[PDB]
Amino acid sequence: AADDVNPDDNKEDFAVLCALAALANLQTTVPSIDTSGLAAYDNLQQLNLSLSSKEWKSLFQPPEGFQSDPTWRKQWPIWVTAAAALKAENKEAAVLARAGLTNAPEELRNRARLALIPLLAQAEQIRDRLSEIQKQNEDTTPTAIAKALNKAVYGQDKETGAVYNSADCFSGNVADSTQNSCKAGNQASKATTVAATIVCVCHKKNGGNDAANACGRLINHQSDAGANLATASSDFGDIIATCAARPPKPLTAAYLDSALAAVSARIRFKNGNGYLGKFKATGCTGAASEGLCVEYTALTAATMQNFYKIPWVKEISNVAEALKRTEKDAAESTLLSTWLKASENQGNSVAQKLIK
Ligand SMILES: *[C@@H]1O[C@H](CO)[C@@H](O[C@@H]2O[C@H](CO)[C@@H](O[C@@H]3O[C@H](CO[C@H]4O[C@H](CO)[C@@H](O)[C@H](O)[C@@H]4O)[C@@H](O)[C@H](O[C@H]4O[C@H](CO)[C@@H](O)[C@H](O)[C@@H]4O[C@H]4O[C@H](CO)[C@@H](O)[C@H](O)[C@@H]4O)[C@@H]3O)[C@H](O)[C@H]2NC(C)=O)[C@H](O)[C@H]1NC(C)=O
Ligand SMILES: *[C@H]1O[C@H](CO)[C@@H](O)[C@H](O)[C@H]1O
Numbered sequence: 001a002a003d004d005v006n007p008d009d010n011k012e013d014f015a016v017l018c019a020l021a022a023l024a025n026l027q028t029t030v031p032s033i034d035t036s037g038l039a040a041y042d043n044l045q046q047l048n049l050s051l052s053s054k055e056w057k058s059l060f061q062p063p064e065g066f067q068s069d070p071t072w073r074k075q076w077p078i079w080v081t082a083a084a085a086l087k088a089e090n091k092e093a094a095v096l097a098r099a100g101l102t103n104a105p106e107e108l109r110n111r112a113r114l115a116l117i118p119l120l121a122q123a124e125q126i127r128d129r130l131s132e133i134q135k136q137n138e139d140t141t142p143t144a145i146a147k148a149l150n151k152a153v154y155g156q157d158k159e160t161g162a163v164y165n166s167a168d169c170f171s172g173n174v175a176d177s178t179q180n181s182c183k184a185g186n187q188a189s190k191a192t193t194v195a196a197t198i199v200c201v202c203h204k205k206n207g208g209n210d211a212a213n214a215c216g217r218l219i220n221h222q223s224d225a226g227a228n229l230a231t232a233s234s235d236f237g238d239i240i241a242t243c244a245a246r247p248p249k250p251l252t253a254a255y256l257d258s259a260l261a262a263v264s265a266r267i268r269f270k271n272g273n274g275y276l277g278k279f280k281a282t283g284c285t286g287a288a289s290e291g292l293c294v295e296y297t298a299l300t301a302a303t304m305q306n307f308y309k310i311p312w313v314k315e316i317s318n319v320a321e322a323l324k325r326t327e328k329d330a331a332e333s334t335l336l337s338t339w340l341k342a343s344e345n346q347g348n349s350v351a352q353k354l355i356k
Contacts, residue, residue, distance in 0.1 A: 005211035005278045005292045010201050013277050014215035014243075016262050017201065020194045022245035023316070024153035025160050026146050029250045030323070031330035033134050037340030041127040044120060044347050045082040046095050051113035057083075100351040108354055115350040123343040130336040133329045140326040145251065145319050152315035155193040164236045166229065169195040171311075174229040178205065179283035179295075181229050184310050185274075186297035192311040195240075199225065199232045200294045201277035202239045205286035214278070214292045218242050225286070253327060256320035260313065264304070267296065274299035274307070 049057065060083035062072040086092050096102050101112060146159045155168035167173045171192045175181040182200035184191040191200050202215035203225040212221045219242050225232040248255050267274045277284070277293030284293040299307060308317055 001288075003280055004288045005214050005280065006288070007211075007213035007217050008215075009211070009278045010214040010292060011216050013201055013266060014198070016259070016266060017194060017198050018243035019245045019247070019259055020263070020312075020316070021153055021198060021240065021243055022247055023149040023194075023251075024162050026142075026149050026247070026251065027160075028142055028145065028247075030140055030142055030145065031250065031326045033130075033137055033326075033330055034333040034337040035130065035134055037127065037130050037333075037337030038134075040337070040340040040344040041123055042078075042082060042085065043095070043098075043344050044116070044123060045078055046086050046091070047099055047347055048113060048116055048120060049079065049082045049086060050092050050095050051101070051109045051116075099348045100355075104351065108351065111354045112351050115354065116347055119343060119347055119350075123340055126336050126339055126343075130333055130340070133333050133336070137322075137326045137329050140322045145322075148315045148319050151193075152312040152319075153194045155195070155311075164195055164233050164240070166232055169193045169199070170229075174232065177228050178203075178286045182284035182286075182293065183295050183297050185299050185306050189310070191294045194312050195236065197276065197294050197312070198239060199229065199236050200284055201292055203229065203232055203235050203286055203292070209287050209289065211278075211286065211288040211292045215239060216242055229286075251319075251323065253320040253324035256316055256323070260308075260316060260320070264307065267299070267307070269300060272300065273297055 049060075060080060061067055062069065062076050066072040086095070093102070096104070099112070101109060104112070143159050147157055150159070150162035151157050154162040154164060155171075156162040156165070170181055170190050172190070175183075175188070175190050178200075180188065181190050181196075183189065184197075191197055198215075202219070204210045204212040204221040204223075206224040206226050210224065212224075213219050219239055221235060221238050223231070223234045223238070225235040263276070267276050268279075269275075270279065274296035275284070275291070275293045276296070277291070279291040279293045279295070280289060282290045284291040284295045286292060296307060296310075307313060
């Protein structure tokens with residue numbers, strides 16, 4: 001009976017699946033876009049406006065004659081924000097004091113503003129890139145990642161409180177038979193979550209002839225999954241009780257990518273299908289003489305791309321791609337914000353040069 005599904009026969013598959021199931025109800029930090037440079041640029045805009053003429057200040061859509069000017073259309077929101085911030089009690093005085101322009105003569109105020117022209121031109125592109133980064137990664141959040149991962153593991157699009165529920169773990173709930181429930185990738189795809197995969201790879205069917213403890217001898221199968229997974233929830237609770245995996249914190253794209261690669265390296269192809277978990281004959285029925293597995297119907301090495309279209313695989317891939325971008329953009333934003341704060345310091349120094 002060595003070719004039958006015996007206890008611990010799916011033990012190593014289960015280790016990988018436990019690592020994936022630990023992505024549920026995840027509370028992770030994400031790489032932060034350092035946007036402190038945006039405030040430094042706003043401070044530079046406020047200095048510039050503070051040093052501007054009464055005619056220019058009185059302007060605060062652009063006025064008639066500049067409504068279609070592309071620079072005014074671009075800058076208007078930035079200028080408006082600077083003007084609004086400067087209206088705050090004592091704000092302008094602080095701006096001018098930080099720049100050494102308190103009670104500055106009119107000639108100095110003018111020369112200082114003009115000296116900011118190339119400074120602001122240099123900072124504009126840096127600030128615009130930082131703002132673009134902020135917008136591009138604004139949906140890479142702990143909440144959105146947790147929801148996507150809970151969709152992957154439990155089929156429940158929620159940030160927390162995700163739990164096993166066959167109605168969500170199997171697409172449209174369990175099928176008429178275990179064999180049909182434990183299929184993914186085909187038209188009638190059912191095992192579309194990590195939890196459904198664990199059920200299919202580890203469950204103890206009722207009726208005898210089961211493969212209890214296939215995923216580990218320390219599982220206490222106190223009940224069973226019923227006939228044709230009708231009561232898989234109780235049995236899943238016992239299986240998952242043995243899993244204590246913890247992903248690295250913060251969660252990284254490299255970790256997720258390696259987890260998915262590991263699964264892909266364990267799927268085995270036979271008779272025109274792919275299988276995760278031990279398969280002997282007929283189907284992934286839960287019977288020890290047939291299989292305790294997911295059948296990736298019609299999956300082949302040449303169609304492996306279709307594995308990555310299975311909902312749980314796609315959800316985790318989406319999270320990994322998003323984190324991949326945000327990791328790089330976060331590292332970029334750190335330098336952009338440092339340069340902008342440096343530009344602010346430079347602008348606060350021009351008065352001392354012009355005076356001397
Ligand atoms: C720091 O704060 C200062 C204010 O103290 C602010 O300066 C102002 O910047 C804007 C945007 O660059 C300047 O807008 C230009 O305005 C002139 C007309 O100037 C008159 O009217 C304004 C408004 O009343 C007065 O402030 C000014 O003193 C004058 O009386 C326009 O002619 C400019 O248009 C050119 O650039 C546009 C950019 O898109 C083009 O679309 C436009 O067609 C013009 O270029 C085109 O034609 C050119 C030939 O004329 C040609 O050379 C080009 O290649 C192209 O074909 C522009 O709208 C405004 O004048 C500035 N005001 C002062 C007092 O300096 C700074 O913007 C602010 N710094 C930052 C970083 O925000
Ligand atoms: C299922 O059938 C196999 C032989 O094909 C046997 O080893 C098992 O004991 C039975 O449950």
